[PDB]
Design a protein around this ligand. Structure first.
Ligand SMILES: *[C@@H]1O[C@H](CO)[C@@H](O[C@@H]2O[C@H](CO)[C@@H](O[C@@H]3O[C@H](CO[C@H]4O[C@H](CO)[C@@H](O)[C@H](O[C@H]5O[C@H](CO)[C@@H](O)[C@H](O)[C@@H]5O[C@H]5O[C@H](CO)[C@@H](O)[C@H](O)[C@@H]5O)[C@@H]4O)[C@@H](O)[C@H](O[C@H]4O[C@H](CO)[C@@H](O)[C@H](O)[C@@H]4O[C@H]4O[C@H](CO)[C@@H](O)[C@H](O)[C@@H]4O[C@H]4O[C@H](CO)[C@@H](O)[C@H](O)[C@@H]4O)[C@@H]3O)[C@H](O)[C@H]2NC(C)=O)[C@H](O)[C@H]1NC(C)=O
Ligand SMILES: *[C@@H]1O[C@H](CO)[C@@H](O[C@@H]2O[C@H](CO)[C@@H](O[C@@H]3O[C@H](CO[C@H]4O[C@H](CO[C@H]5O[C@H](CO)[C@@H](O)[C@H](O)[C@@H]5O)[C@@H](O)[C@H](O[C@H]5O[C@H](CO)[C@@H](O)[C@H](O)[C@@H]5O)[C@@H]4O)[C@@H](O)[C@H](O[C@H]4O[C@H](CO)[C@@H](O)[C@H](O)[C@@H]4O)[C@@H]3O)[C@H](O)[C@H]2NC(C)=O)[C@H](O)[C@H]1NC(C)=O
Ligand SMILES: *[C@@H]1O[C@H](CO)[C@@H](O[C@@H]2O[C@H](CO)[C@@H](O[C@@H]3O[C@H](CO[C@H]4O[C@H](CO[C@H]5O[C@H](CO)[C@@H](O)[C@H](O)[C@@H]5O)[C@@H](O)[C@H](O[C@H]5O[C@H](CO)[C@@H](O)[C@H](O)[C@@H]5O)[C@@H]4O)[C@@H](O)[C@H](O[C@H]4O[C@H](CO)[C@@H](O)[C@H](O)[C@@H]4O)[C@@H]3O)[C@H](O)[C@H]2NC(C)=O)[C@H](O)[C@H]1NC(C)=O
Ligand SMILES: *[C@@H]1O[C@H](CO)[C@@H](O[C@@H]2O[C@H](CO)[C@@H](O[C@@H]3O[C@H](CO[C@H]4O[C@H](CO[C@H]5O[C@H](CO)[C@@H](O)[C@H](O)[C@@H]5O)[C@@H](O)[C@H](O[C@H]5O[C@H](CO)[C@@H](O)[C@H](O)[C@@H]5O)[C@@H]4O)[C@@H](O)[C@H](O[C@H]4O[C@H](CO)[C@@H](O)[C@H](O)[C@@H]4O)[C@@H]3O)[C@H](O)[C@H]2NC(C)=O)[C@H](O)[C@H]1NC(C)=O
Ligand SMILES: *[C@@H]1O[C@H](CO)[C@@H](O[C@@H]2O[C@H](CO)[C@@H](O[C@@H]3O[C@H](CO[C@H]4O[C@H](CO[C@H]5O[C@H](CO)[C@@H](O)[C@H](O)[C@@H]5O)[C@@H](O)[C@H](O[C@H]5O[C@H](CO)[C@@H](O)[C@H](O)[C@@H]5O)[C@@H]4O)[C@@H](O)[C@H](O[C@H]4O[C@H](CO)[C@@H](O)[C@H](O)[C@@H]4O)[C@@H]3O)[C@H](O)[C@H]2NC(C)=O)[C@H](O)[C@H]1NC(C)=O
Ligand SMILES: *[C@@H]1O[C@H](CO)[C@@H](O[C@@H]2O[C@H](CO)[C@@H](O[C@@H]3O[C@H](CO[C@H]4O[C@H](CO[C@H]5O[C@H](CO)[C@@H](O)[C@H](O)[C@@H]5O)[C@@H](O)[C@H](O[C@H]5O[C@H](CO)[C@@H](O)[C@H](O)[C@@H]5O)[C@@H]4O)[C@@H](O)[C@H](O[C@H]4O[C@H](CO)[C@@H](O)[C@H](O)[C@@H]4O)[C@@H]3O)[C@H](O)[C@H]2NC(C)=O)[C@H](O)[C@H]1NC(C)=O
Ligand SMILES: *[C@@H]1O[C@H](CO)[C@@H](O)[C@H](O)[C@H]1NC(C)=O
Ligand SMILES: *[C@@H]1O[C@H](CO)[C@@H](O)[C@H](O)[C@H]1NC(C)=O
Ligand SMILES: *[C@@H]1O[C@H](CO)[C@@H](O)[C@H](O)[C@H]1NC(C)=O
Ligand SMILES: *[C@@H]1O[C@H](CO)[C@@H](O)[C@H](O)[C@H]1NC(C)=O
Ligand SMILES: *[C@@H]1O[C@H](CO)[C@@H](O)[C@H](O)[C@H]1NC(C)=O
Ligand SMILES: *[C@@H]1O[C@H](CO)[C@@H](O)[C@H](O)[C@H]1NC(C)=O
Ligand SMILES: *[C@@H]1O[C@H](CO)[C@@H](O)[C@H](O)[C@H]1NC(C)=O
Ligand SMILES: *[C@@H]1O[C@H](CO)[C@@H](O)[C@H](O)[C@H]1NC(C)=O
Lengths: 338, 202, 226, 75
């Protein structure tokens, strides 16, 4: 990553689209000393531009990225108590404690705002917060039912890994065509209708007694914070989330078409702290659809007033540990003594 | 370009660039001496009066070229054919694709009569010179004409008619000294696999 | 029946403005898109633009600054003007009725939706030659007989403009054996043609070609002798 | 390992031997930035040729390689 000699596929234009994806030309150390060859390069986001002060490129010959069930068990002389109470206040009164040696197996789903895959509630929809008054604390809303979300990114890339040199291992993406729209997704709404209604129901049966509930979109920040940043197999998807949060729920009473969400695939993500960026460099093949079950909501409340006669709720998140509390909610490792 | 076929057989004509985005290809048929006339719209839809012998290739598989297929070809199908490409990733095309001439080989074997005249004394007296090569009584209507100066190909001064109802003409314009210089000039007519030559000298 | 008939001057001088009209019957002009298209000799058609009473109108970018298209509802006609013409604008020009279609997919493919146009009714066309010649008369030379007992014999009609030239033999008393070739348009922008007769080699009849070029008021009778 | 400028010690020949061993000339980064010096190099197997897509060079100041008795015991 130094400088990129990029161009655009636009020969006539409307809306000043530019491009998130660009097919570019480069100068590349191949073999020996100081030889180069003309090489294709793609950048997800004209000359230069590069990367900012770090770039790890994952790639690799044999890998992939799909969450795999991982069980957490207690050792010898240790147990794990487990609240099987369907209605838990989170800080509170639990009647049924059991002790398992090992969990059923938890899947490592890295996402924000919605839980994808994950676990469902046994009885009704359950809302959970560390401090229902403190708006800075997250609200893990667990569903008894999944809201659909089908994501088809029909962007196409052909894998070419040129092994020109010993230390060097280079890829080449950006072949062919197909004119795929960005990367695309859908959320299926009937579930979303009943679920959101029931959520405002739970909210109004908890802290919200008599209030009109409104849901505005993300408040702003890093691309991982503004969009529903999740992964479809190692590429980082970012979705405009207005379609999920654009409904004003009337306190008076309740009030085939599917919701289609605009998404983008990224290669350059920022893992860890800033020790380095991570790239999934050769997205292989094309036309890859991931069907998911919306198992969740992570919310932060917009501190409002009482003269507004309404309560506003915004998508929050970021620390995946919240997602694990949303998963590791019924496990606490304990030890036994005579 | 050119595509030739026997009556009853199937002709195929390729036009335009390889597809990039989704396509709507329009095909037009233009008979000799006539305005262009259409054939197909929306890749495979036909207007009133067009039979199902004419079919267009789907606006489909990426990186491929649009093709017009004509089955059970008849002599009436002889014409120039043009496409107009609409491709979702390309600008509006304001020029039609390059045309293809369909030849229907219905009849054999008539051989051309060639006659070659030297420049007239009067033209020479006008300080001009023209060699006249007359070609007639041939069918089909495809010939090519080439000229030779001695054994050398002529690179300039040749004007040749497209034949019509066949007959064709070729004229070599020379100066009087060019004419007098060489041992001879030759008119070579290429027709249906064979070449007939006539020669002329001062 | 929908019927279009183009008209124009036939000849335009370089730098002048070309003005063409398309007379329409069998439909009203307001109710159609109308497209002008042009096609040079030996080339593929080159369109020009489309116009609609609605204002949904567009011009070929390469001609953008020189072209104007209009509809006249009162006279039921479509018009074209093209300024600053050159030889490159010489072509057969056609008026047509332009229909619109859309390629529509799933919303996942919205970026790939597009409209296309097709020209479903054409006029007979009007020929436009942009050249600079007021008139030019032909030069006529005999093609002498020299050599089945039969010889050929002719007249060369050199360097005239415009078409056409008529050639007869013996005032009309020889139409058999007669072959008058189509004219060639030379790189000079002038035409030439030849006419020939095939006759028995044996000093009876006299052979005279009569050439007439009406545009230049030229008539020439030329005796052709061995 | 980039390119090798090799020659042969054969000034007269039979059997078309070529050579498995070659004494070669090179261009070598020594100290500082972008200086070189003419250096001998041997290749066991004319210009170029190099290595194919990996080369670890052991060498080292103090080493050798002779098998040493290793006992395997049960815990
Ligand atoms: C996210 O949420 C959004 C909504 O919020 C959803 O958006 C949808 O996106 C999908 C995915 O692309 C859309 O599906 C495309 O729809 C196109 C338009 O379809 C409309 O118009 C067609 C007429 O062409 C009409 O038939 C359609 O209704 C049909 O289906 C409904 C049920 O859905 C049914 O009730 C109707 O009766 C219709 O069914 C008839 O037609 C069917 C075929 O379309 C037959 O199977 C059936 O028996 C019956 O006859 C609708 O009103 C449509 O053109 C597209 O079809 C294309 O492309 C498909 C691939 O993407 C491919 O599978 C199809 O075969 C077809 O390809 C063929 O046709 C196209 C042009 O039509 C050619 O370019 C191809 O080459 C190919 O040609 C073949 O067929 C030709 C015609 O028969 C023939 O000439 C040729 O020879 C070949 O044989 C897509 O199917 C959908 O429209 C969007 N919905 C909305 C609301 O807009 C989205 O679903 C959601 N995402 C997820 C994950 O859920
Ligand atoms: C991403 O964007 C970049 C631009 O930013 C773009 O980059 C292209 O990359 C591809 C692949 O590297 C290039 O395609 C190749 O082009 C080669 C050169 O073609 C040019 O020159 C042709 C003749 O060249 C010969 O002679 C010249 C001197 O005259 C000499 O320099 C050459 O070395 C060579 O000896 C010329 O014919 C050609 O133009 C043709 O095509 C255009 C339309 O594109 C058309 O208008 C012309 O009439 C003509 O038909 C061009 O000017 C070429 O040799 C090479 O072709 C060989 O390999 C391919 C397989 O790869 C075979 O299919 C083919 O049969 C040959 O064996 C190949 O086509 C291309 O030039 C780059 N473009 C630019 C601007 O640099 C990518 O396209 C973009 N990618 C995507 C996904 O869109
Ligand atoms: C994005 O890019 C990706 C690549 O990264 C690209 O991926 C393509 O995916 C599609 C769909 O899966 C593939 O399409 C199929 O290709 C099959 C293989 O075709 C190849 O081999 C053909 C013959 O193979 C037979 O014999 C060989 C041994 O010789 C054996 O290995 C095979 O198993 C098989 O037995 C060969 O004919 C073909 O080449 C043809 O086409 C090219 C031009 O593309 C032309 O140059 C050749 O002259 C020839 O005409 C090719 O080499 C193929 O079998 C299969 O076709 C069947 O199914 C389709 C329907 O799917 C029917 O229409 C057809 O009649 C057959 O029944 C099908 O076409 C394609 O191969 C992948 N491409 C690559 C590079 O791997 C995507 O297209 C891109 N996506 C987008 C969105 O743009
Ligand atoms: C969260 O929940 C969602 C569901 O809501 C679920 O989503 C999964 O996402 C993962 C990762 O993207 C998917 O995994 C991949 O699945 C690919 C498709 O597999 C299906 O189809 C297989 C064959 O497909 C070929 O042919 C069909 C037409 O027949 C065509 O459509 C395809 O494109 C393709 O050409 C089929 O074999 C497979 O079924 C197998 O497994 C099931 C059990 O799961 C078994 O019952 C069957 O007998 C069979 O063994 C399935 O139906 C698949 O191609 C792909 O595999 C490739 O990549 C992996 C690496 O990623 C390699 O290991 C492998 O060798 C291949 O190269 C991969 O497995 C999965 O399909 C989605 N599931 C659904 C329902 O959409 C996630 O799993 C959940 N996430 C978490 C947290 O676990
Ligand atoms: C690549 O190049 C191509 C050209 O080669 C170019 O093509 C353009 O494509 C876009 C998208 O399709 C077109 O944009 C639309 O234009 C519509 C028509 O606008 C014209 O007419 C307007 C009035 O029409 C109304 O009233 C008439 C009755 O008179 C009625 O029949 C019509 O149906 C309609 O109701 C007129 O106002 C307008 O002129 C305005 O703008 C120009 C400057 O551009 C200015 O000079 C004028 O003073 C005036 O302000 C024009 O003459 C238009 O209706 C439509 O707008 C609606 O939709 C958009 C959203 O799409 C809304 O934002 C808007 O509020 C309206 O609801 C839209 O703008 C455009 O016409 C094409 N250009 C040409 C020349 O045809 C592309 O831009 C390039 N890009 C690509 C990839 O295609
Ligand atoms: C460096 O350069 C030097 C020169 O400066 C050069 O020196 C050569 O060294 C090699 C190896 O020692 C010699 O090769 C041998 O030559 C033997 C003699 O061959 C000559 O005579 C042949 C017949 O001799 C027989 O009969 C005579 C009586 O007439 C009798 O006295 C002899 O003892 C013997 O019985 C004759 O056939 C041959 O000519 C043949 O080849 C030439 C082309 O080279 C061709 O033109 C002829 O038509 C004919 O085919 C020549 O005149 C020879 O016997 C011997 O061959 C035997 O051994 C080899 C294996 O070593 C077997 O393969 C083969 O089957 C026999 O059993 C062998 O070939 C050579 O003579 C030297 N050259 C000179 C000029 O003296 C080296 O090549 C260079 N390299 C190095 C590093 O030294
Ligand atoms: C590579 O080539 C481009 C021109 O195509 C040039 O701008 C750039 O400086 C070159 N890079 C190197 C490594 O010299
Ligand atoms: C949950 O506990 C808090 C006090 O810790 C209380 O305000 C709230 O009413 C409790 N919810 C239920 C269901 O009792
Ligand atoms: C929760 O936050 C509110 C302020 O937002 C505070 O008043 C309350 O004491 C907090 N509860 C705990 C347990 O800290
Ligand atoms: C995606 O598919 C599932 C079934 O696999 C369906 O329930 C859901 O409605 C689909 N999504 C959309 C938006 O249609
Ligand atoms: C999507 O969200 C952004 C802010 O994150 C907002 O500005 C934009 O209007 C939304 N897009 C749509 C389609 O509503
Ligand atoms: C949400 O929907 C309302 C209408 O209910 C609309 O006015 C608004 O523009 C939409 N907001 C977004 C960001 O989509
Ligand atoms: C999503 O939920 C439905 C039933 O609620 C089920 O059909 C589907 O398989 C689920 N997806 C997963 C990941 O199990
Ligand atoms: C080193 O020198 C040789 C010629 O002796 C030359 O071929 C080669 O390119 C040089 N290498 C470098 C590092 O420039």
């Amino acid at each position: 990553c130094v400088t990129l000699q990029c161009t655009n596929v636009t020969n006539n234009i409307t809306d000043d689209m530019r491009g998130e994806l660009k097919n570019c030309s480069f100068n590349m150390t191949t073999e020996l000393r100081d030889k180069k060859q003309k090489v294709y390069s793609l950048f997800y986001r004209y000359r230069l531009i590069n990367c900012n002060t770090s770039a790890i490129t994952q790639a690799c010959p044999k890998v992939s990225f799909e969450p795999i069930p991982i069980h957490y068990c207690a050792p010898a002389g240790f147990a794990i108590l487990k609240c099987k109470d369907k209605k838990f206040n989170g800080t509170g009164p639990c009647p049924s404690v059991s002790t398992v040696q090992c969990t059923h197996g938890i899947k490592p789903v890295v996402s924000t705002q919605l839980l994808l895959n994950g676990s469902l509630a046994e009885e009704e929809v359950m809302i959970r917060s560390e401090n229902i008054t403190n708006n800075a604390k997250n609200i893990l809303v667990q569903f008894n039912t999944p809201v659909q979300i089908n994501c088809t990114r029909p962007n196409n890339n052909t894998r070419k890994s040129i092994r020109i040199g010993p230390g060097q291992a280079f890829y080449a993406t950006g072949d062919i065509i197909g004119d795929i729209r960005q990367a695309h997704c859908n959320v299926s709404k009937a579930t979303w209708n009943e679920t959101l209604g029931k959520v405002v129901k739970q909210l109004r049966k908890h802290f919200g007694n008599n209030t009109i509930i409104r849901f505005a979109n993300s408040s702003g920040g890093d691309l991982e914070v503004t969009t529903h940043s999740f992964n479809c197999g190692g590429e980082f998807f970012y979705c405009n989330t207005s379609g999920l949060f654009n409904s004003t729920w009337i306190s008076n009473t309740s009030v085939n078409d599917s919701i289609t969400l605009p998404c983008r695939i990224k290669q350059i993500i920022n893992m860890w702290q800033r020790i380095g960026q991570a790239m999934y460099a050769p997205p292989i093949q094309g036309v890859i659809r991931c069907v998911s079950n919306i198992t969740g909501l992570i919310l932060t409340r917009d501190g409002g007033s009482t003269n507004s006669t309404t309560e506003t709720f915004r998508p929050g998140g970021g620390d995946m540990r919240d997602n694990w509390r949303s998963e590791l909610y019924k496990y606490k490792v304990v030890k036994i003594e005579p | 370009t050119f595509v030739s076929v026997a009556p009853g057989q199937t002709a195929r004509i390729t036009c335009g660039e390889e597809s990039l985005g989704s396509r709507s290809v329009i095909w037009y048929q233009q008979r000799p001496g006539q305005a262009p006339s259409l054939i197909i719209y929306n890749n495979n839809d036909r207007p009133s009066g067009i039979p199902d012998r004419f079919s267009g290739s789907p606006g489909s598989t990426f990186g491929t070229t649009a093709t017009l297929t004509i089955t059970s070809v008849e002599a009436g199908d002889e014409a120039d054919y043009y496409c107009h490409i609409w491709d979702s990733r390309r600008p509006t095309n304001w020029v039609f694709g390059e045309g293809t001439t369909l030849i229907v080989l219905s009849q054999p074997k008539a051989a051309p009569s060639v006659t070659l005249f030297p420049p007239s004394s009067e033209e020479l007296q006008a300080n001009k010179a023209t060699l006249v090569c007359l070609i007639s009584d041939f069918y089909p209507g495809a010939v090519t004409v080439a000229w030779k100066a001695d054994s050398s190909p002529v690179k300039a001064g040749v004007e040749t008619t497209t034949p019509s109802k066949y007959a064709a003409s070729s004229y070599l314009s020379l100066t009087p000294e060019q004419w007098k210089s060489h041992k001879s000039y030759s008119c070579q007519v290429t027709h249906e696999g064979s070449t007939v030559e006539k020669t002329v000298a001062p | 029946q929908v019927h279009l008939q183009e008209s124009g001057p036939g000849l335009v001088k370089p730098s002048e403005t070309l003005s063409l009209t398309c007379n329409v019957s069998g439909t009203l002009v307001r109710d159609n898109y109308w497209s002008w298209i042009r096609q040079p000799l030996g080339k593929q058609p080159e369109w020009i633009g489309y116009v609609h009473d609605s204002g949904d109108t567009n011009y070929n970018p390469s001609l953008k600054s020189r072209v104007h298209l209009s509809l006249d509802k009162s006279k039921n006609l479509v018009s074209l003007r093209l300024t600053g013409v050159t030889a490159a604008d010489s072509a057969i020009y056609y008026c047509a009725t332009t229909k619109h279609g859309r390629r529509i997919y799933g919303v996942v493919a919205f970026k790939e939706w597009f409209t296309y146009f097709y020209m479903d009714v054409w006029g007979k066309g009007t020929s436009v030659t942009v050249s600079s010649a007021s008139t030019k008369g032909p030069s006529v030379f005999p093609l002498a007989p020299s050599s089945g007992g039969t010889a050929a014999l002719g007249c060369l009609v050199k360097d005239y403009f415009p078409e056409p030239v008529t050639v007869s033999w013996n005032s009309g008393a020889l139409t058999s054996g007669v072959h008058t070739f189509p004219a060639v348009l030379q790189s000079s922008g002038l035409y030439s043609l030849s006419s020939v007769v095939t006759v028995p080699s044996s000093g009876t009849q006299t052979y005279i070609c009569n050439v007439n070029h009406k545009p230049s008021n030229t008539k020439v009778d030329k005796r052709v002798e061995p």
